[PDB]
Design a protein around this ligand. Structure first.
Ligand SMILES: Nc1ncnc2c1ncn2[C@@H]1O[C@H](COP(=O)(O)OP(=O)(O)OP(=O)(O)O)[C@@H](O)[C@H]1O
Ligand SMILES: Nc1ncnc2c1ncn2[C@@H]1O[C@H](COP(=O)(O)OP(=O)(O)O)[C@@H](O)[C@H]1O
Ligand SMILES: Nc1ncnc2c1ncn2[C@@H]1O[C@H](COP(=O)(O)OP(=O)(O)O)[C@@H](O)[C@H]1O
Ligand SMILES: [Mg+2]
Ligand SMILES: [Mg+2]
Ligand SMILES: [Zn+2]
Ligand SMILES: [Zn+2]
Ligand SMILES: [Zn+2]
Lengths: 39, 607, 594, 594, 39
């Protein structure tokens, strides 16, 4: 302030859209005989 | 908002002081006498009429209905309190439970304040079952109408039993014994499942801390009869656009074994939840059973009945949009009224239809199912089954003196063909999933519909040459009508004219007699079911005269026309069915002649 | 820590009560509550623009803060009902407010439903896909303590937790009668499949329904629901709480632009007779021949007009066409044309949609082990079009399920203790190669594939196209093919091909799509002349039935009626025409006679 | 988790209203509340035994269960007042219940108030020693939030803590008028000093007063309080919440036994003339001589009669004696005779009680740094006796305050802003040896001790006893001394002494104590004959005043009035006898004329 | 069940009187020239 535990009150919780993607090295950019890296 | 102790005294007053003049005007404490029976162990189930409480306290009745479970416990404990008063005899120790109860009472009496735990549950001081019966004021409620609003209340409903599980013993109060202190431990049970107790909470082992581990004892515990069933909405309840909805019902104690699948029963009981969490908990509902009962115009209407073309007008009203086939429409009407079943006689009129696809056949059945007061539709499940562990009745059972319309009859499984054979034979369905020939009373009329294989019918190919059914089974049908797509340019044009009018009007062309509302038709049918016309023996002479005549025609026919005593009996069914349409309790020569005419036309359809 | 007075809530409730106090004014809302009381329901409907007109500030307050303002509104409504009748108010623990009318920004789609709308009213328009079972949700549970002889209550609302013991560990017994329960159903909405890009992903939004709102929705319904979009307790999950639901008409209308209407009317009035033939030539110009098939495909798109009788009949206006022919024939190319061309279409394979298949299916959630009624591909095509490829490869269960929709247009399911009767009225264009290729004109059309002859009866039309090795015909097709190959855009230098982009006389597909949509609104009725003419034609076809495809039957008659009705739409005639029936008659004769 | 109905509390609340519904019955309680309405107070007084009569069970529940039962009773009271008058009820936030009547075992003393009575009503009896200042205590604080335009409450009741910010951290400004405050005071009770064994430790019990009960008590008041004994939050401090306080008269009554009364009556009726001297000889039998002193000391114990006049003049009935005499004379011995015999006496030294001293004082608690007005020895001896030794060594402030209490029997105090005025009417028996020993019989007793010439006027009597070295007198004393020393108890062998105890004609001291206790209640009054006779004697002393101890003055006249009053009490004669005035006159003559 | 902190409820917390004393070894029983112990 019960110590650590707290209750979230979602009514005032402001949120935004959210999306995770994965990108890869282009096939030209990869070295010969190498695995493209992923981020 | 109200002291249950105060309510407890009012019911005890009502029980001990309500009476009604019995047969010969005998002023009798109806419940009091039952209490005397109960104290003697002469009764177990104590059904309670709420209208008796309505006789002197309708306010109490509404309070009872507002929370049925609460007042049930109040009534039960009131009976538990008044039992020693009405006790006059010490009946023999019926079963171990009474003597075990007596031994428990003796040890309790051998004990002065006492903690709430160290005292027997009231539900173990039992072997009297208590129930209510819904008031006449509260009308029976459609299943779909019963929603979450009415939970926690007593209500009365009506429906059809789709299925019932076997009777099984449901535990009421688990009983245990301590390992060390040897004290008895009790555990009433509410949910369908529970965890057995382990350590004894008795005072001695509590103090001794001797690791007293409870072990259950079936003899100590108390069980009750208990079966599970799923009633279904009655056909009339469901609108045409909707479908029936099921309601699980938990029958227990004496109420068990009182119903079978297909029984058009009426149930009164409490609608309560069972928990077998978004913004609150979600929980399945059920209806705890209390009472079960297996159930069964204007002058101008009579003038219409007096019309000689009345049944003809009714026949025209059967699918009037279906141009033609009026003789068939009459035959469908005979099926709807059915026979009489005088004594017995098989009053069911099973009719089979065969013909090329596209001849209103499918549409005809749908109209019949709509018109039928109780009916089932199928294509070919049909028969009963033992689901895994419950008897689930098929649509044949759900007919139950209604009509089981069966489209696509030719493509039925041959096993089902054998099954319906039994139905037409004995009006029963024997099924053995586990080699147990469970038999169900499947009284009903069967309206079959099929088409010849390989396209349209071929007259050059004999009957059953174009159709893949046992010819014997065809003979079992009361009537068998054939429809052939004969290109008749005028009649086909007449049908085309009929279709175009319907497209341009969404109505059939104006007939001689307009079709009547299906409710009016059903009312006439219900009136016809009231009648059971008899067969005077004078008619038998003419009937037999006609029968031997047509039997001679069969011998004259190169192909056997299935004439037999079956044919005679069917003619008897049709004639008395016509007598029901006439509202006359004697079959007429006219009725006999017309039935022969339809029989001849059905045979002529085989041309 | 006890709240005493909320002046804002006090005034806001008064403002609603003044608004509900509709006696000095036209009485529209006073009459509504009076009608609501007679209805015996407990959910008034409200148009937002009335609130804007009477108080713009209050309406803006409502839309920006849906929750608290509605609570004040429901407070005012119950008080207002109690004013009109106390006992009727006492029947129900509460009342509810249904919103309606125009919403500028808050009227969105699941595609456009951004996270920003949280706590705001939103009018989401879309299509129902999944529906859960009706379940009774507990909201307020009353308990009784015999030891203390004391009654205790609890409210859950938005807030294991089911209390069973007193603080002194006395047993508690739940007064089931006094406890409050309400039916509660969950459904899912998605964007209308016609107006959604293929590149983007689904945007499924979960909806909560309670009380009367529970079963005012089914899978595969085009609806708009107004509700309060909210998060959920825990990155969070978000759901919409319905305040009012309505099933908009699935036909809708082709608003578009008046310029499109004028161009349509100008083109229609240019050559009304040739519009049918001209459209057919421009329907699938990449494929040469099969012109009668193109005419039928146009008839399928326009379709007929459903007729419903006093007996509850629903005599279908839809048309169902089956195409059979050897592989490497444009059948597949025809379906691509229809998908690009049709106003509301949806493709599917012989397998059908994954899991759900062609028609609906019951699927457990497997995230909470929860049953869900999932609409299938067929159901979503209701009052639209479905294109089925590899129709021969339909599964046996689907081979049976197709019968109901083909006959009644409605699929039913009672399985898994789950009862539903969904609408699937959809003109269907099916196609299937013959087995082993190499069609033989000696066996039945069924025997080359296997359809049981019930489906062939159900289909309005069947067309058979064969890989005839006629050098003249093959020259005509191949020369057409190479002409399409040689064809280059006017702006190009014969050099590079089109870029590999990430994105995906003859009239335009769009303008044609607009016109058929407009034509679909038209409701051509029968003419006594054409009715007499077609009846003679049918009886003539019955006379033709003496010669030894399926024989002519009443199915074929109604098929012709829809075909003439479809051609009546094609020329925008408000009634059918002898030209319409005549075109249908030759089309049917071509189908059954080569 | 929100209670709905309490059947027990409902019935209990109903039963109290039924009990307070005293209309068909004798109407006593209906008249009480009507008087309460007229008198504007808000604390009904109730005899518990009448509640037992109407409902023994409820009365048992009330005594055993205090906090809940009273709350129901207050509810019934508030509704009952509302029944008789709504607006008067609405004036007060709440109402209170006052208990009375016989409390069987719950009537205890601070010694006997064990922890077993916790949460049980208790009727304690004792003496108030420590008092705290009146303070207003908040109970219901009311706050306003201009940001939210919202008003909240927060009760405290039995329960950083003060709320000042909205949960949104908006400021909250309190609403002083709306909030509820109540005056609140703390005091401490102890067992009555006369009936309190020396072996046992003090058993002091705290008390909490609120509302009108705040100021209805002062230090040194003999009071009976009825309240609910409760623990406190934390080995836990325990306090008593007063439900009603009443000041029992310090006169009380001589309960004893009728046998004691009969023995006293027989003894009184035996020889009324010699009872004074017989008591006097048997008053201090160990002491030899000083017969006038013993006679004087008896009069002091008997006490005169206080006269309170129409103007508020309060001529004291108490008598004051000072003993001056050379050391090793039986002065300290004489007072211990008085301590053993006096019905209500308190010993003390020149310095007085620690901190508080002789008279009252203000004391910071130092456990909370809190002021406490603490009673001193003089106040505790009210309507009693105080025995001061080394009175010469009394401090100067005490030499100031002694003037007030001697003049008025009333110590006032205003220190630390603590206005108070404590009753201190107490006959005083001071003793002080001459300074440096060896009294000079030439100057004043003041000149030998230094009493500032005023306190000698205040003292009604002043007796000098010098160690005159007469061999005859010494023989008389030494004969007496050795006779007592040589004495052995009747059962003894002239062997062992008394064991080392681990616990602490001639009439018994206890018999004397009981007798004088009875005699104090008697209220003898003047006779005209004696009134005439004493006036002659006083004038005669004035005539004898011509020679030149202090002169006879009007102080001396009233001193004789009290002495004749005292001797009248000795014989239980309700009319003062000429013998009484006779013995007083000669006694005074000895005091001033050796 | 807030965590370790709990609210005591004095209304039901029954108590009894309480007193501590110190007892010393007797002067007879102490050894010569030794301090008596306390308990
Ligand atoms: N005699 C008739 N009068 C009126 N309508 C008819 C007649 N025969 C057929 N029809 C029409 O035929 C249309 C389509 O055929 P229909 O549904 O009757 O086939 P069916 O005979 O049930 O076929 P099947 O058993 O092969 O499935 C129906 O809409 C029905 O209105
Ligand atoms: N009449 C035709 N005109 C133009 N192309 C045709 C024609 N018939 C077949 N094709 C060719 O067939 C290909 C598509 O075949 P497809 O429809 O997928 O075969 P199927 O449908 O039998 O599996 C197209 O590339 C198209 O060019
Ligand atoms: N007249 C007397 N008779 C008996 N004892 C006396 C008398 N006068 C003095 N004493 C002795 O004096 C002692 C008490 O002296 P105390 O009163 O303490 O001296 P002071 O009061 O002057 O300080 C007693 O032990 C008592 O025996
Ligand atoms: Mg293909
Ligand atoms: Mg001394
Ligand atoms: Zn905190
Ligand atoms: Zn044990
Ligand atoms: Zn906890």
């Amino acid at each position: 302030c019960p110590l650590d535990p707290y209750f979230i009150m979602p009514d005032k919780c402001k949120c935004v859209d959210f999306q995770t993607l994965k990108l890869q090295e282009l096939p030209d950019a990869v070295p010969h005989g190498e695995m493209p890296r992923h981020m | 908002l109200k002291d249950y102790a105060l309510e407890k005294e009012k019911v005890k007053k009502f029980l001990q002081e309500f009476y009604q003049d019995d047969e010969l005007g005998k002023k009798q404490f109806k419940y009091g006498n039952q209490l005397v029976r109960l104290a003697h162990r002469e009764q177990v189930a104590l059904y309670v009429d709420l209208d008796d409480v309505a006789e002197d306290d309708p306010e109490l009745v509404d309070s009872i209905c507002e929370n049925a479970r609460r007042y049930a416990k109040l009534f039960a404990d009131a009976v538990q309190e008044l039992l020693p008063q009405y006790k006059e005899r010490e009946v023999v120790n019926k079963d171990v439970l009474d003597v075990y109860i007596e031994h428990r009472l003796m040890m309790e009496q051998r004990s002065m304040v006492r903690s709430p735990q160290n005292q027997y549950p009231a539900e173990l001081m039992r072997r009297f079952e208590l129930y209510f019966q819904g008031p006449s004021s509260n009308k029976p409620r459609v299943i779909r109408e019963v929603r979450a609003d009415s939970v926690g209340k007593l209500v009365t409903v009506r429906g059809i039993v789709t299925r019932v599980s076997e009777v099984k013993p449901k535990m009421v109060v688990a009983t245990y014994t301590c390992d060390q202190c040897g004290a008895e431990t009790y555990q009433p049970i509410q949910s369908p499942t529970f965890m057995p107790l382990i350590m004894c909470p008795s005072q001695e082992c509590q103090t001794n801390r001797s690791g007293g581990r409870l072990y259950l004892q079936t003899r100590g515990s108390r069980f009750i009869k208990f079966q599970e069933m799923k009633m279904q909405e009655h056909s009339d309840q469901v609108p045409v656009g909707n479908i029936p909805r099921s309601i699980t019902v938990l029958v227990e104690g004496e109420n068990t074994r009182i119903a079978q699948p297909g029984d058009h029963v009426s149930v009164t009981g409490i609608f309560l939840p069972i928990l077998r969490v978004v913004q609150g908990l979600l929980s399945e509902t059920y209806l705890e059973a209390h009472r079960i009962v297996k159930m069964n115009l204007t002058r101008e209407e009579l003038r219409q009945i007096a019309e000689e073309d009345f049944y003809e007008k009714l026949a025209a009203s059967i699918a009037p949009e279906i141009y033609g086939h009026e003789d068939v429409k009459k035959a469908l009407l005979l099926l709807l009224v059915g026979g009489v079943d005088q004594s017995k006689i098989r009053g069911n009129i099973n009719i089979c239809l065969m013909g090329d696809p596209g001849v209103a056949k499918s549409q005809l059945l749908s109209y019949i199912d709509r018109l039928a007061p109780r009916s089932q539709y199928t294509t070919g499940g049909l028969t009963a089954a033992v689901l895994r562990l419950t008897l689930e009745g098929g649509a044949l059972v759900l007919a139950d003196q209604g009509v089981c319309c069966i489209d696509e009859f030719d493509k039925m499984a041959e096993a089902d063909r054998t099954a319906i054979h039994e139905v037409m034979e004995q009006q029963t369905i024997s099924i053995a999933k586990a080699g147990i020939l469970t038999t169900l009373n499947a009284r009903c009329s069967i309206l079959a519909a099929a088409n010849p294989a390989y396209g349209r019918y071929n007259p050059r190919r004999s009957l059953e040459q174009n159709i893949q059914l046992p010819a014997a089974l065809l003979s079992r049908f009361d009537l068998l009508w054939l429809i052939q797509d004969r290109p008749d340019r005028d009649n086909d044009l007449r049908l085309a004219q009929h279709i175009t009018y319907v497209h341009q009007h969404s109505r059939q062309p104006p007939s001689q007699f307009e079709p009547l509302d299906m409710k009016l038709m059903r009312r006439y049918i219900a009136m016809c079911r009231e009648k059971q016309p008899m067969v005077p023996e004078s008619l038998a002479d003419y009937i037999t005269a006609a029968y031997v005549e047509m039997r001679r025609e069969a011998w004259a026919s190169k192909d056997a026309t299935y004439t037999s005593a079956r044919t005679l009996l069917a003619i008897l069914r049709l004639s008395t069915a016509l007598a029901r349409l006439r509202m006359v309790d004697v079959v007429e020569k006219e009725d006999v002649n017309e039935a022969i005419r339809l029989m001849e036309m059905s045979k002529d359809s085989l041309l | 820590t006890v709240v005493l007075d909320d002046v804002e809530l006090r005034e806001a409730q008064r403002d609603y009560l003044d608004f509900l106090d509709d006696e000095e004014d036209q009485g529209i809302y006073q009459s509504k509550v009076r009608e609501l009381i007679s209805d015996n329901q407990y959910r008034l409907i409200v148009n937002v623009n009335d609130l804007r007109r009477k108080n713009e500030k209050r309406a803006n307050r409502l839309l920006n803060n849906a929750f608290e303002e509605l609570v004040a509104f429901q407070r005012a409504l119950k008080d207002f009902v109690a004013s009109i009748d106390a006992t009727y108010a006492k029947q129900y623990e509460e009342f509810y407010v249904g919103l309606e009318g125009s919403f500028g920004s808050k009227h969105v789609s699941p595609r456009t439903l951004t996270s920003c709308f949280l706590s705001c009213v939103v009018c989401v328009e879309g299509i129902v896909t999944k529906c859960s079972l009706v379940r009774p949700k507990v909201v307020r549970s009353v308990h009784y303590c015999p030891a203390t002889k004391k009654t205790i209550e609890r409210r859950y609302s938005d807030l294991s937790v089911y209390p069973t013991k007193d603080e002194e560990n006395n047993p508690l017994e739940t007064e089931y009668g006094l406890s409050v329960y309400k039916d509660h159903q969950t459904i899912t909405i998605q964007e209308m499949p016609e107006k959604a890009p293929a590149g983007q992903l689904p945007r499924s939004v979960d909806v909560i329904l309670d009380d009367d709102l529970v079963d005012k929705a089914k899978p595969g319904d085009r609806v708009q629901v107004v509700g309060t979009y909210r998060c959920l307790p825990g990155t969070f999950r978000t759901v919409l709480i319905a305040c009012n639901v309505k099933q908009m008409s699935k036909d809708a209308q082709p608003s578009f632009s008046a310029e499109d209407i004028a161009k349509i009317k100008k083109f229609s009035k240019t050559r009304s007779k040739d519009i049918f033939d001209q459209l057919a030539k421009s329907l699938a110009p990449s494929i040469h021949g099969h012109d009668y098939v193109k005419k039928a495909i146009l008839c399928l798109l326009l379709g007929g007009v459903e007729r419903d009788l006093e007996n509850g009949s629903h005599i279908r206006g839809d048309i169902n066409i089956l195409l059979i022919g050897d592989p490497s024939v444009a059948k597949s190319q025809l379906l691509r044309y229809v998908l690009c061309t049709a106003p509301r279409a949806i493709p599917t394979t012989g397998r059908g949609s994954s899991g759900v298949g062609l028609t609906a299916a019951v699927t457990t959630d497997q995230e909470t082990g929860e049953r869900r009624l999932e609409a299938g591909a067929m159901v979503l095509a209701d009052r639209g079009v479905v294109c089925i490829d590899e129709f021969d490869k339909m599964s046996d269960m689907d081979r049976t399920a197709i019968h109901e929709v083909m006959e009644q247009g409605r699929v039913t399911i009672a399985k898994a203790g789950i009862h539903a009767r969904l609408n699937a009225r959809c003109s269907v264009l099916a196609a299937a190669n013959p087995v082993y290729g190499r069609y033989d004109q000696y066996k039945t059309p069924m025997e080359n594939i296997g359809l049981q002859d019930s489906l062939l009866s159900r289909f309005d039309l069947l067309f058979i196209m064969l890989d005839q090795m006629d050098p003249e015909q093959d020259r005509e097709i191949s020369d057409h093919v190479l002409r399409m190959h040689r064809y280059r855009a006017p702006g190009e230098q014969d050099g590079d091909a089109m870029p590999l982009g990430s994105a995906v006389k003859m009239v335009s597909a769009a303008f044609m799509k607009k016109y058929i949509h407009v034509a679909k609104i038209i409701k051509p009725v029968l003419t006594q002349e054409s009715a007499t003419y077609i009846a003679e034609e049918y009886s003539r076809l019955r006379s033709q039935d003496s010669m030894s495809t399926s024989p002519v039957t009443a199915r074929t008659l109604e098929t012709l009626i829809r075909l003439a009705t479809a051609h009546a739409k094609a020329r925008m005639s408000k009634t059918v025409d002898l030209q319409d029936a005549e075109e249908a008659v030759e089309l049917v004769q071509y189908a059954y006679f080569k």
